[model samples]
Target chain A: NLSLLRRPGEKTYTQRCRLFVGNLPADITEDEFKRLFAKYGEPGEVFINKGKGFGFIKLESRALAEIAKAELDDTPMRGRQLRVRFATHAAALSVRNLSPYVSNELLEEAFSQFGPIERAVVIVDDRGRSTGKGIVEFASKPAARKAFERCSEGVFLLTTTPRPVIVEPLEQLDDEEGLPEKLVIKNQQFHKEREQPPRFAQPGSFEYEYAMRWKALIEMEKQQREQVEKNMKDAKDKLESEMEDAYHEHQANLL
Target chain B: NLSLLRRPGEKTYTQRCRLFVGNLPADITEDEFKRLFAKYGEPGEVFINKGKGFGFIKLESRALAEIAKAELDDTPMRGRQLRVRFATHAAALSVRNLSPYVSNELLEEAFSQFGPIERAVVIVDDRGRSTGKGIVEFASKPAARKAFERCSEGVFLLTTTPRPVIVEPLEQLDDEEGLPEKLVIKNQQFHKEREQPPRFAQPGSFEYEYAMRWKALIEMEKQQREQVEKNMKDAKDKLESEMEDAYHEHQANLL
Candidate 1:
């Protein structure tokens, strides 16, 4: 039932929902995740996020699943966060697939016709060129889910183009700090000694400067990652605690 | 105040402290951070930090610190949380100077003498030759702190065999994603349009493919840098929020 017009009680492509899954191992297969979740009313889909460390599991009912979440929030599904709930509105902002070369007017026309548009951003490069990635937000989650499940991947998103558009639920980009650094070195027993003369040493050359800069850059980048990781963890914990405190206080007031 | 023996009230290098400062622009300097924090107490040193955001204020007290933190916790400075706290133990475990020929077991044995060590890692290339960098973590914070502060440049700390050691901080390495698939069409704008007929159609060959790939790689590298800038903004926000939250939480617990 994909339709251009909405039916009453039919969650449009813009309806919002929170979906999380867990109990999968680090090397858990996508097939395994699908099979496990299929038992609960058809699981719409899963976003196989990479470096971000978690995936999304869209459901038919965002509200009904809250009961399931309580029973299995921390239960180790695949050794990941299994707590399910509706996603925050800002969650959609991270999806950058539509290239910036995409005009604002085109985006506004396409997504707005679906619903009242909150935001649309075309991910641009440093040089202000579009990277062919853009995000569009609608007011309703059902609409969002509908769009995500139906529109993701080789669907013809634009009527103007007969060609299929490439789209997918966002995948996590790898962290620059976590990536390995390679320095080209020859001679001196596997190149352990930095001061040892390079077999093809060129003093004050671009190659020499590159080696120095690359090492320094790696060190600097690594340090930055550590700090970010620490900060993020701290923020998450603090936010969780704050929410709990607020809930408890409200409960006390009701009593 | 500089004493070899540990003093009861004297603050050491490892006892980190944070600060809350307002009214500074985005381009605030490290010296400015020092000057701002000095109003409360003498900051022994200040590091603006590698995360490209907020600065750290190293104070000269452990007990009196709570007094300072209490006055500012949750009090909005510059319409944002002005956080203050001590630096937690770094997750970065090992900071060792490694050699190529050294085996993993031997490296562990050497680092273990520093304290009860958890793990020792020595990085190597695919050919199993040392990358000349490694890390060693002690089970106890005090031990880690001692190792961190004491380990100096030159004068080997661990090995019986005398090798000059230059230990700074152990941090992660930044990884660079490969080249872009983009070409600058504007740069080729001077050339006649294909529709206008070829002034001279350069014959395409295997070399053209190589050239395109090479150009894309260069653009991709630049894209990675642009991506890093975006990440850094998020990092800065995270750091500021965490500091504020930590400071407030500490106060609530204290009270």
Candidate 2:
């Protein structure tokens, strides 16, 4: 493998500690992955995609990851041998505990203080609503680990908001199943709606065609509007549903 | 109040098109505000805070905003006097159509292609998960408008992902009450967990004291972990509960 493998340069060295953990069970959680991988060394962050059966784990040092790869490359867990290798990408963290008031700028400001960031984002919904989560990709594993631990200092108030945010590592979901299920469906609907021709505007009378053309545009707008409205309602319903369950549980617990 | 107004310089002129509309009825929707405010000229984006009794509306031009301000400063809206004033901040857009693959860097790269950005953020949860929404703040109203329109040229795929994003002008939420109530509660819990002293550490034998310290640390960790788990479960339940009500309403409409 070394004959064909690329040698580490300055930048490559920074990215060396990141590992690709493949053939994961669909039920594998970040906590589980972290616990398993932490045996090799301090695992910085673990990104597992249950749907894709793969994940990336960032360790504290490249040397430790190499040791891990050598020892656990074909190790069996959950009836599958994990295919471990050095990840080609920079180390990153899917961080959470961002205050609702935290913006991308604030998140960037908060994390960039540790070291150079490859990427940072605060996720929001289609209606431009904040979901209160974010991802920060660091140029190196050490930088990411430092950012993760430093940001987790409990009382580091980025804003004057009464509550402090706790930064936790997260795994990035795979691309195909990345967006929420409802959003993916909405996108499919949007594409389908755009592709469909004006159903009523076929070869017909001038009067009929004119009326149909107006109807078609109106219908198109209405369809798009309905799709968006549905998406909004879905989000609202989900949030409200969550709240109801919490309320019931709280009541049961007498909290 | 008009006599007390300030004139626009180069910098002030860039910021003047945005208007702060206060004392609004909490129920005013975007469409309703747009319909009412469109008379002054094309309204850029109207931000209505449902919980707070106010919102900010960006106009197409500073001149139009000034004229509207003069005419509508004390205008009646739903039996309340509207407090209209020029906003001091740059105009922004709530951009969606993000692939979970798109990081803050990619988003910045996509929007910054238009002009210098004042701020740009992709909203995420405390877990650093993408909500699929972003805010792109431009240095001026024109820049914001340009970015909004330019980014709307669908299929501007920043990543190898499918689906195009849409951009709409967005009003920033006021700082004091920016996050959801539950998130605030979670933050308070986190703070309490951090502040609570090791409860079981007692004055006793050295070995007993050592054991007590360990027990206290473990118990504290367990307590914090339990609290977060409870909070997450509560949030999930509430959202599901709300969804149940909405589902019923949807089914009722079907009937």
Candidate 3:
């Protein structure tokens, strides 16, 4: 149920639960972005725009995003200072899979029908082309929550063509000392050394040879069975071919 | 101050305070030992025996040693299950800086004079070469502690050459998750972005040129001072070399 509508008792997505990250280095990759955000928590998803010099990271939870924002705001990366903040509006809806004809006014009217709207925007490129994504902000959390649930029923554009719309909370996506590193090494050592425990019989023991022979015999039997199957199949094909030849001869005599 | 004797108020090292680690891989180095033990706490000092499949780690505190022993005992490393325990006897003294002539029997007699010793040993190499290290176990902690203080007065070997000895308590040997890495990057971002808070002037303003000139002047002065120090060092070397030549000439004349 990837519905944009928030059901009763369902959590609503909002910008307050998201972070706005800016001043990213232009060359940063999605992996680098994810790795940086992963420390805050498992970054459930990450989006980076290398050309725009910024990226958004969606955290697993709002609390995690808040914690990340508090700790990472104004941080530096790659000799560049980072700016992190909550989105301007706390309660906003992210509607994706939008129709190209959907405009800001159309989204505002559709979402405003439920409650008072703070802002509405249809995202666009430099060419002013719709990117099929937009955001709608409500005056209050309940209104936002209410509209999110109601809008998913069928938020449509002026165009006759229909598109599936996805609504989610907006996010500004965006450790330890030596003890942790050492602990990891210790863990690795623990795993590496215990990789093999005493198994079955000793490798050179008579019982080990006996087990080996048993395994070899099973393998030989499997091959032999396969060979027999192949021979039977060949015989069946020979009989079918012979029957077809006799049928043709009988048909010719009848003619 | 570097005496072998334990003074009053000196704590006796106990199993609660130390760990005995065995079955170590022969190739393990002091750094590896330290790195492994450091996870438990700040490893004050570590001793490793490359020949024997064993080594001892002295942690900063008994609590740390206790934790380490509990966590690391039977842990696997390099295909070997590590054996960790407290020193054999709960109450024992570590003796160090002994004369190589000091024998195990001699060490026992010297320590036994203070209290009945349960066991005594002067650590030795494969060829029975004394390593100038030894341990003496007492029937009780108080006895061990008492012997440690009493034996330090004059626990000497029969050898005519006197060497200073040191005694200490013997136990075995006695010896955060993800947030940190992200915090560091965040910190870096903060510092990089806000390195200067609205510095002296706008980059393109006339005041900015004045600030730049002032900074350049300070940098030049710093370089000049370093150059002066270099010149002084060169002159000192020249004088020393010249004086040595004159002294050699005088020695030749005397000859």
**CA lDDT, every model vs. true structure:** 0.44, 0.56, 0.54
Candidate 2 segments exceeding 4 Å error: A1-255, B1-90, B171-255
Tens-digit lDDT track of model 3 for B112-147: 766777557777543334555777777567887776
lDDT of 2 by residue, A181-200 (tens): 23233365345333422122
lDDT of 1 by residue, B1-255 (tens): 213122233334333233433334455677766655554566665666524445555555542334445554445544556555434435235443444444445555655555776545566532334656666545556666665555441134233212333455444321111012232242332132111220111225322232233334334544666566566546545544554465456458851
Candidate with the larger lDDT of 1 and 2? 2
Worst 10 residues of 3 chain B by lDDT: B173-182
Cα displacement (angstroms), candidate 2, residue B250, comes to 44
Which scores greater on TM-score, model 2 or model 3?
2
Which regions of candidate 1 are displaced past 4 Å? A1-255, B1-109, B118-132, B139-142, B145-165, B169-255
Task: Provide C-alpha RMSD values for all models, in order.
Answer: 23.4, 20.4, 38.0
Candidate 3 C-alpha lDDT tens digits along A162-241: 22345665541110010111212335434532333312344554333433443344345446555554654465455445
* Model 2: per-residue Cα lDDT at residue B246: 54
Chain A TM-score of each candidate structure, as shown: 0.31, 0.37, 0.34
B52-82 in candidate 2: lDDT tens per residue? 8778886655445666776787789989988
